[PDB]
Amino acid sequence: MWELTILHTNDVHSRLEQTSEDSSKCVDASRCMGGVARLFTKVQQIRRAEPNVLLLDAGDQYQGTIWFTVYKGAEVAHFMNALRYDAMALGNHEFDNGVEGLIEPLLKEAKFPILSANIKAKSQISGLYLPYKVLPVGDEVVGIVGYTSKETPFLSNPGTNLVFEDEITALQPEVDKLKTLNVNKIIALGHSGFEMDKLIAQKVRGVDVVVGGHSNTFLYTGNPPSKEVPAGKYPFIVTSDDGRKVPVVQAYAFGKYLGYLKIEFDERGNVISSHGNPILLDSSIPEDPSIKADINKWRIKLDDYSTQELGKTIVYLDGSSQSCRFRECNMGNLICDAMINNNLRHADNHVSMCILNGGGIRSPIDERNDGTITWENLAAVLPFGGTFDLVQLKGSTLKKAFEHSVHRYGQSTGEFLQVGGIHVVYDLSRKPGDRVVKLDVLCTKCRVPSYDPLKMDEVYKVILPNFLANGGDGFQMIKDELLRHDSGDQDINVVSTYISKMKVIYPAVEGRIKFSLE
Amino acid sequence: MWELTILHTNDVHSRLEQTSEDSSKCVDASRCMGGVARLFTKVQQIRRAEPNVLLLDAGDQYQGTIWFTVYKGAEVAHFMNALRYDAMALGNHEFDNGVEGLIEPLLKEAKFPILSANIKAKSQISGLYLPYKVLPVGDEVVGIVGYTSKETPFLSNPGTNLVFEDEITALQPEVDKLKTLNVNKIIALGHSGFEMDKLIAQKVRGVDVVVGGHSNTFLYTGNPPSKEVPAGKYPFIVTSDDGRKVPVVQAYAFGKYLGYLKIEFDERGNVISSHGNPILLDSSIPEDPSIKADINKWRIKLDDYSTQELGKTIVYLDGSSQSCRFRECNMGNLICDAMINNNLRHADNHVSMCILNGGGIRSPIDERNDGTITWENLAAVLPFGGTFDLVQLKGSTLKKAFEHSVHRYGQSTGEFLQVGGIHVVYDLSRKPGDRVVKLDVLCTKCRVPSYDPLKMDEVYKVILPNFLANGGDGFQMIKDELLRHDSGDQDINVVSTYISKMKVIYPAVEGRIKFSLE
Ligand SMILES: Nc1nc(=O)[nH]c2c1ncn2[C@@H]1O[C@H](COP(=O)(O)CP(=O)(O)O)[C@@H](O)[C@H]1O
Ligand SMILES: Nc1nc(=O)[nH]c2c1ncn2[C@@H]1O[C@H](COP(=O)(O)CP(=O)(O)O)[C@@H](O)[C@H]1O
Ligand SMILES: [Zn+2]
Ligand SMILES: [Zn+2]
Ligand SMILES: [Zn+2]
Ligand SMILES: [Zn+2]
Fold it and tell me: Under a CB-based contact definition with an 8 Å cutoff, are residues B334 and B319 in contact?
């Protein structure tokens, strides 16, 4: 028997410092979690105890906090090198600052192999990322094959030169080449989501284990340690088409947990068994002093975004995925109110309605730090540098959008819409495409605004992110059927301006989105 | 036969200049109405044609616009003298600036008798107002007996020295004294409301006609000329207990109409018949040039309140009685939002709920003048100089208040509540005291504010006018059952500050108050 311990992270999203339990800024240090200093301590503890260890990342280190807005990936390469990661797979967010934003900060400075077998460039990038790497682990070798979401061209900015192939089609020839080289232990490490990960495990002959990301999937065996509810056991077992039991793992997001899987291999590289669980990186684990002092050094340049108080909140600003992708969330209401307020000011075409993809809200903000709101706090909520555009839509188009908002409800997908100037009621007992039971909107062609049923043949002006106006999140009907599209102001500046104007904010959940009982 | 024409006004409330159809500031002069210059032209036209004319006012000339805030009744005495009113009865609003605010500006400068038979002082005021006046009208005499709401001590500030008697009890001895003096034509002129006016007509032996006010009652015979819906025919006929047909008249409010009644008397002063209708003072009647030039002279001092733009509205600000005393009105929502915003700022005890008596909103604001909002526009909405106080109430107390809000619904009474941070649903099919079918409130002891059912044994912090905290509008339960009462900022300054902060406002009717179908 040859035992291998796989340590893994995914969707860290620039949470270099320890955070609050909800992955927002750490205020109460006594109860904070995650961060690269704490992760280091745990990884070192495991490396001291286990002789065959691999520390892997399944992508999306890029984007999420002021660390990335300021260092643009230099902090990723630096701290991933300090933690001595053995390999990383490319995620979609590694392409947000173009191919140039991946090459210079990360690919040229990473001391570990960076992988993706399904990205074919059509050179300069040649060899800076690899389809696989064969890693020596003691007296054995372990092959790691990478993969990246085939949806990256739509989700990010990888440019016209990179081609993204079907993951299964691109992986099988690389795995087969590893098998011809007598590499009998193979890990598929990549960034496509738990559903594709299970398909890779079922269909790619020769893959012994799948380490994934992108869906922020939390898996656990037994009673879980924090607020994340498990989507399945850890590992999730897939029975492959050739009859092998293949463990599939993921470790939520934001560096809150360290994925930990122990695999028992025979002499021919068959998985005899495996077990483990994600480790909660809570205050019980001390932050490594050396890494922490280096974090404090890099932190000095960021304190310019933490000194200006933009305003104050007397309520918890719920920007969590568990709220904003499933129901009305007060952060969504705040952002839509700021969006509506911004246009109802610098017009010289006035608008009363707002739609906002819940997945575009990427962090909550806590009210306990004397309720202070800084640019840094807002940078984690809106880390993409998008704009809030004005569009003219038909009622029929809006109805289709709201049907699309709940067409596959319950999967924590980002299309669920937050709103302003709209009162929507859904009936999830109904069939996809027929779940909107009520859709009232704030009249524009009226002297006193009031809510009236949306009319399919009428025309409404809606403020929304450029992501939705360009057909993102499957909102193809907006891009195809829109009658007008005007570019707007930068997302973060619109919310920043609105908070400074209000001074004290208290957004509520007030019935803009409801669910019927049937 | 001896014919008398009674011309009458009531509840003018400082509308010295012509106004918009809704009695707010005149912007589009082409379609404006009322004002003392237009009234003069009509009164003169009638005086030229009819030999026996009396021009009467049934009170509440005081309070309503910047004219009264600045001239404090000097404009009333001046312009009522210019129009040559024959008599006036004291209304409750004539006592808002104390007895001193009535004596000096009006009683000492009025060239016509000022009347009230049921006000007994317990001197200086002696003879400055009279219980009645016997007026020569051609070769005859007409007795006018005055009366004032017995509720004036609670509604206004008449002081501890004035006693207000039951109107019927005080009137009969004065009418009997007039009959002993062979005065066979008697008009009761007063300010107690249409219901008391009908009782006076039924019960006071010797009264030939009743000219009233206070309830802003619009009466009309036939198809009406504007948006006011008639509450009955003009005149309203009461059959007295001694079997006489007694006409009862009123002429809405704000100087929009001139009440016009022609009475045919026999030689013994019996009313043989009567007929007429309120005359709409619309653009068809020219404004008298002489009065208009004198109005323009007095207007120069007021233009300091019309030059500073506090902000802009892109919606009609519905502060009409027909909206705010019957359903959710967007002016009510604006004022409650300003009330909530004001305390959620200069705390150093935070509060999320607001209640506002609809009768405290005393004018709309139009959005068509490039949407401009001035101090003058706000002065007509909030003309009383009240404050928005903080109170701590039990849920049981709040439930009683909301039951009181609709206990006598449909009478255009001012207790109907406008709200903030509250979602109330009424069922008017239910019995008084049991009409609240749903009462949800914005949680305070929660990190994310949301609406939850009000709990009878819990405690809430509510911002409301001092008028309601002191038990006004029959809200005795607030004054008696409150747990804490902190005095607040001046009503007009709170709304002014909030509009300047927002710059562009667009309050909507959004479902804070609803009515069920049963
Ligand atoms: N450029 C943009 N602008 C946006 O406003 N939102 C975006 C934009 N890129 C994405 N997203 C949102 O992010 C969601 C995906 O988040 P996750 O489920 O955590 C997968 P990922 O983090 O990409 O691995 C999408 O469903 C979108 O709603
Ligand atoms: N001092 C105050 N402060 C207020 O906030 N509201 C007041 C205050 N005095 C009164 N009112 C309101 O005015 C309403 C009466 O208006 P109308 O029916 O037009 C009779 P009136 O104008 O008095 O002849 C009451 O029901 C109250 O709601
Ligand atoms: Zn991610
Ligand atoms: Zn991703
Ligand atoms: Zn009045
Ligand atoms: Zn009155």
Answer: no
3-state secondary structure A396-450: HHHHHHHHHHCCCCCCCCCCCEEEECEEEEECCCCCCCCCEEEEEEECCCCCCCE
User: Is the torsion defined by CA of B428, B511, A428, A434 positive or negative?
Assistant: positive
Residue B316, domain extent: 309-518
**Are the C-beta atoms of A409 and A417 separated by less than 8 Å?**
no
Specify whether B101 is located in the same domain as B74.
yes
Regarding whether A415 and A398 lie in a shared domain, the answer is yes
- Between CA A13 and CA A21 the distance in angstroms is 15
Distances in Å between the Cα of B298 and the Cα atoms of A30, A210, B73, B79, B103 are: 70, 86, 13, 10, 21
3-class DSSP string for A188-251: EEEECCHHHHHHHHHHCCCCCEEECCCCCCCCCCCCCCCCCCCCCCCCEEEECCCCCEEEEECC
Q: Are residues A125 and A16 in the same domain?
A: yes
Same domain, B275 and B355: no
Resolution attained, angstroms: 2.5
Please tell me whether residues B247 and B365 are part of one structural domain. no
What does the alpha-carbon distance between residue A413 and residue A357 come to, in Å, rounded to a whole number? Answer: 10
Q: Is the CB of B105 under 6 A from ligand 2?
A: no
Judge whether B509 is closer than 8 Å to chain A, CB to CB. yes
- For A301-324, the DSSP string reads TTTHHHHSEEEEESS-B---HHHH
- In the chain, the amino acid numbered B194 is F
CATH number where A485 lies: 3.90.780.10
B227 and B343 belong to one structural domain? no
Burial of A30 (0-12, 13-18, 19+ CB in 10 A): exposed
> Does the C-beta of A214 come closer than 6 Å to ligand 1?
yes
- The candidate with the shortest Cα–Cα distance to A202, out of A174, A231, A240, is A240
Pairwise CA distance, residues A59 & A119, whole Å:
14
Ligand 5 center to B486 CA (angstroms): 29
Residues around ligand 5, an ion, CB closer than 5 A: B 11, 60
CB A357 within 8 A of CB A331: no
CA A164 to chain centroid:
19
* Phi, psi values for residue B166, rounded to 5°: -60, 130
User: Given strand A459-465, what is the order of strands in its sheet?
Assistant: A417-420, A353-357, A459-465, A387-394, A484-490
Determine contact, residues B143/B204, Cβ cutoff 8 Å: no
- Distance, in Å, from the CA atom of A343 to the CA atom of B320, rounded to the nearest integer, reads 29
Q: How many domains does chain B have?
A: 2
CA dihedral B165, B171, B172, B177 (to 10 degrees): 120
Residue pair B430/B373 in contact (Cβ under 8 Å)? The answer is no
**At A444, phi and psi to the nearest 5?**
-110, -40
Closest CA–CA distance from residue A461 to any residue of chain B (Å): 15
Q: Are residues B300 and B313 in the same domain?
A: no
CB of B225 closer than 8 Å to CB of B280? yes
Closest Cα to residue B261, out of B1, B9, B514?
Answer: B9
- Among residues B261, B292, B308, which one ends one of the domains? B308
State the Cα–Cα distance between residues A52 and A140, nearest whole angstrom.
Answer: 9
